Design a protein around this ligand. Structure first.
Ligand SMILES: *Cc1c(COP(=O)(O)O)cnc(C)c1O
Ligand SMILES: *Cc1c(COP(=O)(O)O)cnc(C)c1O
Ligand SMILES: [Cl-]
Ligand SMILES: [Cl-]
Ligand SMILES: [Cl-]
Ligand SMILES: [Cl-]
Ligand SMILES: [Cl-]
Ligand SMILES: [Cl-]
Ligand SMILES: [Cl-]
Ligand SMILES: [Cl-]
Ligand SMILES: [Cl-]
Ligand SMILES: [Cl-]
Ligand SMILES: [Cl-]
Ligand SMILES: [Cl-]
Ligand SMILES: [Cl-]
Ligand SMILES: [Cl-]
Ligand SMILES: [Cl-]
Ligand SMILES: [Cl-]
Ligand SMILES: [Cl-]
Ligand SMILES: [Cl-]
Ligand SMILES: [Cl-]
Ligand SMILES: [Cl-]
Ligand SMILES: [Cl-]
Ligand SMILES: [Cl-]
Ligand SMILES: [Cs+]
Ligand SMILES: [Cs+]
Ligand SMILES: [Cs+]
Ligand SMILES: [Cs+]
Ligand SMILES: [Cs+]
Ligand SMILES: [Cs+]
Lengths: 395, 253, 395, 253
């Protein structure tokens, strides 16, 4: 039994070992209670505003759209404290941990971005944060490891199995299954078992709520479409949620196409995988014929995963949202274009959303359209990646 | 599931508990795994729990993750595991064979077809590690349609509603992780006979389980540790497995 | 003749070759006009809000001050687009360039931070930006060079003289002396000849104006002191300006003490140099006995200069503002403290302001005091520097 | 400043223009610099403009920045420059000596004391490169109290107010960077005699300056280029300096 529906249509659920069900039920109860509690809401609003910097700007491009009938706005989550939208929901989950009387946070990380977000929320709120990370990942991610340690988090190398992300996640969940009385597992996207897809959406929904108010104020109408990149689904569902019932507004999610869908080196399970069950959820995933989970690929680590959160699969299935892909090379061009023409260095994740909007503009340049791109993060972290690629091909 | 009913009846006639080792199929390769499994039975294992290697297990401890990777990296596939299972069943008519599966491998080509293949090769039970009773309906339905027992875990943190559900929905045995009271309530609710599976690595834990009125004990990883320790010597691996299993079964009697 | 006073007491002036005086007079006129023009003000407000993200948060520390009678707020210029307060004034100067009918920007850079700020403003406003940089600097600053080039700026290596900052500045000014009809020289701090100290203050003054409004709203009173680091003087004068006439509010500027004042390896000319004339201004500077300009030193490049803007020298002289120093090691401790206890990675520049506030708290922990630190920038750029130091001494 | 008045009177009696080379003192070392300077005079330089190396010049082109760094890196100090100036004056009683200074070196130990030291060593004029007429009051006052001409630049972009100020405030000569009209207005306003200093690197530019009714020409960097080109051969350096200066002075006559 649960208080809220764990499914979105056929997708979602709570596919965890029995031992973790009380932990999920506890968290669901605390979330339902928190959502009715004005004092929780006020504490969360205070962190979002005074610590993270909300509201985030909505920037009108001009140079990028010159000579077309596209008006393009960027929702500036790149300006949030921490450099990306991930900060929003880790703050909310940290407050839920305190609401349940916990003073410890568990997380896992691969490239280190969610780990840094978890560590900063935990530092602010005086929570003891342990972050599991596969030994192979620790060795490749010294900058993020150092940032997490500076923030007081304990980064715990995991040497078992393949010593990468799945092994780190396993250990984090093993820990949580024993420690959930005192420790909260801080899931880093709108995926995994209920109630995480729901919680993450509600703790990211200010992206779309602000966007709606800002667009009305500036344009006097809703956007024709809002466009977001999709790794696990959090920035995109936070942009979309407040527009779901505005049926004139297009919701476009952009998966990473990697080297090209046809190459199989991509991270686009919603349109190019197959429903399966893993990481707590029934959801699209990239799979071998015999049901092993395939390795994904993207130039952008934040999008590089073989699954997606279930609410996206559902919105797709019913036709409310449309999902597309953008390749590494398209994302790179968009990155270069925003730097040169707007003076903003976007995350390569976000560059996939921007690339799709540029394509909507360029393919049909006399089409009148009001577009909002969810600029999920800033791209300082990506300058070496971009440098290396441009150099390699001689630019 | 009838193999379990027959086994427990026979053990009850002997006032004995069951001893049930877990191994990963194909660890550390197919040939050695088949030998391991024959050794476990010959040494007195009452039933087996066998794992199918999966790319991303999120519900197994380090020892098991390590074994998963040995088998998986050696190219063991589910199709090969099912070839192995048919061969194991062909050698051992009465030994109950239980699988420990991740949901994706069961759901991949259709839940019903998965259980139909289990029935074809002679498997007796399936425990799906990441399907809690709340999500179990399609799995247990397919299991029962194909004469397969659905196994559920009764965890440390169980409440009365959970006890009643596990008792009602499970068959074959109840996988058990106060203790004498869980065993009592499971019996009251007519649950499948309980096997204690929490950290069973020594003879005294087997006798304790019997003394607590459990039907027996499952060694969730001690057998795998022995494999891991003896990789460089297959012969010694079999010798140490045989000694361990013999000691553990003696404790049940 | 000028429209505004070029001096602050004895400090300031226009100590440039005669050929540059028309350029300075032109800029002064355009600034005076712009400051009276509601449409210029509205365009500047629009960029500040919708592109740069103003207002910036005012964050109340709690963990850092626990068990003392200090209440500490951080003015979050680290959250501005570009990662530091420099963005504010480059946007304003870019608009002044357009007001004068110019479409080209000239700047020079050493470590590259002002160059990046100049490039991003120029990219947004469609201005052609050339940035002079000494060849020795280009070779050491590949990341900032790459960021400037991504933003479309032309980075012009300077090989003459010592091929560092003075040579780059010389070339930038030589260029400007010939091109000032079409090109604007974008000075990167509240220093140099009139009218730059004035312009830079007025285009940074929203820091203190916002701070005043935010503190009143949250505390119902003005701060006891506002505290800012001082490289050339811009973030500090932008924090101070709106409080100058509130004579109860302390204005504390923090110069870099480097290895220790006594070592001579520091960048603290206001308290430890000597008035002189250079870079267009009469101002405190670090000098040899025979009047050569000394090399400064700080762990933090943004503070590492041997002079300071003239309005600070003046505010000091009359006793309205007080100036102190903080050493490399004090700044490093403050950096570590904010990361661990507040989840914010501050620029090492800003860490000098924070270090002084921590000292005001720790020295006198039962003193009731309401302090605001001007958190001028974020410190992602400094993590390797900090890593290297901590490793070297075995931490 | 009387050396300039006497020089221009004498040149006027000969219907000749003045030719004035610039060099940095101590470039490329003190001994070679003294030889260079003697060579310039012997070859027919009418007066000298001499620079004092400064750590951070912000008003000189690449050629001059390069020379500044040769002298500065060779450890030439202002005190050594003033020793040189006294020696130069001791060798050459009538040749006007003008300094090109950055403000800090003049302001360092007191503006008045700087000009007093100029007077003690026999300097005739000072041009302060980064002091515009608007800021010049304390410099020109100290200069005149010590019988030193304050030199001002009249730039391309000059207006009438600037012409009147330069004419009123300067002495010795006006450093000039339509052209015949600037020269006419300077004369109308009783300015110090004009020397054209814009890019003077060939004999025909010297004759053009004379034909325009300027008093002569200043070679702001051609002499320094010759030094830079001949660093590896001091003898050849002197030979090429002598030829260049001789050619330039011939063009004035
Ligand atoms: C983490 C991240 C993403 C992808 O995660 P979602 O949960 O799909 O939003 C996208 N952009 C940025 C900048 C990120 O940091
Ligand atoms: C540039 C910079 C400074 C120093 O310059 P000021 O003109 O003194 O403000 C300080 N902090 C940061 C973060 C900077 O980028
Ligand atoms: Cl419900
Ligand atoms: Cl729904
Ligand atoms: Cl369902
Ligand atoms: Cl409210
Ligand atoms: Cl970041
Ligand atoms: Cl803590
Ligand atoms: Cl590092
Ligand atoms: Cl650390
Ligand atoms: Cl653990
Ligand atoms: Cl509303
Ligand atoms: Cl396959
Ligand atoms: Cl005035
Ligand atoms: Cl003033
Ligand atoms: Cl004055
Ligand atoms: Cl207004
Ligand atoms: Cl930055
Ligand atoms: Cl351009
Ligand atoms: Cl680079
Ligand atoms: Cl580029
Ligand atoms: Cl130039
Ligand atoms: Cl007001
Ligand atoms: Cl000295
Ligand atoms: Cs447009
Ligand atoms: Cs994905
Ligand atoms: Cs039963
Ligand atoms: Cs306090
Ligand atoms: Cs300084
Ligand atoms: Cs005169």
């Amino acid at each position: 039994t649960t208080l809220l529906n764990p499914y979105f249509g056929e997708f979602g659920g709570m596919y965890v070992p029995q031992i973790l069900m009380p932990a999920l039920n506890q968290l669901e109860e605390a979330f339902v209670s928190a959502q009715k509690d004005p004092e929780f809401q006020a504490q969360f609003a205070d962190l979002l505003k005074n610590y993270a910097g909300r509201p985030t700007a909505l920037t009108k491009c001009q140079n990028i759209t010159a000579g077309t009938r596209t008006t393009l706005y960027l929702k500036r989550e790149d300006l949030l404290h921490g450099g990306a939208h991930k900060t929003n929901q880790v703050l909310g989950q940290a407050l839920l941990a305190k609401r349940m009387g916990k003073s410890e946070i568990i997380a896992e990380t691969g490239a280190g971005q969610h780990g840094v977000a978890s560590a900063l929320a935990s530092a602010l709120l005086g929570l003891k944060c342990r972050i599991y990370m596969g030994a192979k990942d620790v060795e490749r991610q010294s900058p993020n490891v150092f940032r997490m340690r500076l923030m007081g988090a304990e980064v715990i190398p995991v040497h078992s199995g393949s010593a990468t992300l799945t092994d780190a996640c396993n250990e984090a969940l093993r820990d949580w299954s024993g420690s959930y009385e005192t420790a909260h597992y801080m899931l880093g996207t709108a995926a995994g078992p209920h109630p995480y897809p729901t919680i993450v959406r509600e703790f990211q929904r200010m992206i779309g709520e602000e966007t709606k108010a800002q667009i009305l104020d500036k344009e006097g109408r809703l956007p024709d479409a809002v466009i977001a990149c999709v790794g696990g689904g959090s920035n995109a569902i936070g942009m979309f949620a407040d527009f779901i019932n505005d049926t004139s507004v297009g919701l476009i999610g952009v998966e990473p196409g990697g080297h090209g869908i046809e190459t199989g080196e991509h991270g686009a399970p919603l349109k190019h995988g197959r429903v399966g069950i893993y990481f707590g959820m029934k959801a699209p995933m990239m799979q071998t014929a015999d049901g092993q989970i395939e390795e994904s690929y993207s130039i952008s680590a934040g999008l590089d995963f073989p699954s997606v959160g279930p609410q996206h699969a559902y919105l797709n299935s019913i036709g409310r949202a449309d999902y597309v892909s953008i390749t590494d090379d398209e994302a790179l061009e968009a990155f270069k274009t925003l730097c040169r023409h707007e003076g903003i260095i976007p995350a390569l994740e976000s560059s996939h959303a921007l690339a799709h909007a540029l394509k909507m503009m360029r393919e049909q340049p006399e089409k009148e359209q009001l577009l909002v791109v969810n600029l999920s993060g800033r791209g300082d972290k990506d300058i070496f990646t971009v440098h290396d690629i441009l150099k390699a091909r001689g630019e | 599931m009838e193999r379990y009913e027959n086994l427990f009846a026979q053990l009850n006639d002997r006032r004995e508990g069951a001893f049930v080792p877990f191994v990963t199929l194909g660890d550390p390769g197919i040939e050695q795994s088949l030998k391991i499994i024959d050794t476990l039975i010959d040494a007195g294992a009452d039933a087996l729990e066998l794992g199918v290697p999966f790319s991303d297990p999120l519900a197994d401890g380090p020892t098991i993750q390590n074994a998963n990777l040995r088998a998986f990296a050696a190219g063991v596939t589910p199709a090969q595991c099912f070839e192995m299972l048919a061969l194991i069943r062909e050698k051992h008519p009465t030994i109950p064979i239980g699988l420990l599966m991740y949901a994706n491998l069961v759901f991949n080509n259709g839940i019903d077809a998965f259980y139909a293949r289990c029935e074809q090769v002679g498997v007796d039970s399936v425990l799906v590690a990441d399907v809690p009773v709340e999500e179990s309906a399609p799995f247990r339905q397919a299991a029962l349609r194909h004469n397969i027992a659905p196994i559920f875990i009764c965890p440390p943190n169980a409440d009365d509603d959970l006890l009643r559900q596990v008792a009602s929905y499970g068959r074959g045995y109840t996988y058990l992780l106060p203790l004498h009271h869980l065993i009592e309530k499971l019996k009251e609710y007519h649950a499948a006979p309980a096997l204690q599976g929490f950290g069973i690595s020594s003879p005294e834990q087997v006798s304790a389980a019997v003394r607590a009125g459990a039907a027996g004990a499952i060694s969730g990883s001690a057998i795998v540790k022995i494999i891991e320790k003896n990789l460089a010597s297959p012969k010694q691996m079999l010798a140490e497995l045989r000694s361990f299993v013999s000691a553990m079964k003696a404790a049940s009697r």
